[PDB]
């Protein structure tokens, strides 16, 4: 019963991560042509893309932290 | 420019709505696969209910935070198109 609880929590975390990993994956492939972006635009697009991944890894980590906090409360019961 | 951002924000909201429903249906079918009510003691019934609540609480809490991440994505994307326009 407990093992199914921890496996369910981990399966939900993987699906949430895939939802954001896929949107960030295809979004970078839709940017304008390299001949239309200024060197500042390239630096602005790069800091934009990097910041999204920083916010993505931060929320994938904060979800597993909440999952570990739930498993502990379920095992003690 | 304005139609581009609105088409982008509508795309994110439609994908978020599909992901939320997909999550609600799988949690629905996962909870519907449990032993019969005539086989669970009152102790097991209370344990199975807290089981479903903790999973749904962990799902609804991060569905809200994903919408929070989408709002942060739309705002930073509009600021980028503003730099692209100017």
Question: Whats the size of chain B, residue-wise?
Answer: 86
Q: Tell me how long chain A is.
A: 77
State whether B62 and A63 contact (CB < 8 Å): yes
Contacts of B15 in chain A (CB under 8 A): 19, 23
Contact: B15, A23; criterion CB under 8 Å: yes
Chain B residue with minimal CA distance to A44? B80
Chain B closest CA to A8's CA: distance in Å? 8
Q: Given an 8 Å threshold on Cβ–Cβ distance, is A5 in contact with B69?
A: no
Q: Which helix (H) or strand (E) holds B63?
A: helix B42-85
> How was it solved?
X-ray
The Cα of A23 is separated from the nearest Cα of chain B by a number of Å equal to 9
* Distances A71 to A4, A67, B7, B35 between C-alpha atoms, Å: 11, 6, 40, 22
Most B CBs within 10 Å, among A8, A42, A59, A76, to test the B interface: A8
Which residue, B55, B11, B15, is CA-closest to B31?
B55
Taking the C-alpha atoms of residue B56 and residue B46, their distance in angstroms, rounded to an integer, is 15
At residue A15, φ and ψ (nearest 5 deg) are: -70, -40
> Can you tell me which residue has the tokens 């209910």?
B49
Instruction: Look at residue B40 and give its three-state secondary structure.
Output: coil
Q: How far apart are CA A30 and CA A26, in angstroms?
A: 7
Distance from chain centroid for Cα A54: 9
């Amino acid at each position: 019963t407990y093992e199914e609880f921890a496996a369910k929590l981990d399966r939900l975390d993987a699906e949430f991560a895939k939802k954001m990993e896929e949107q960030n994956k295809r979004f970078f492939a839709d940017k304008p042509d390299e001949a239309t972006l200024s060197p500042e635009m390239k630096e602005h697009y790069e800091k934009f893309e990097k910041m999204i991944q920083e916010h993505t890894d931060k929320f994938n980590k904060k979800m597993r932290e909440h999952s570990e906090h739930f498993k502990a409360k379920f095992a003690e019961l």
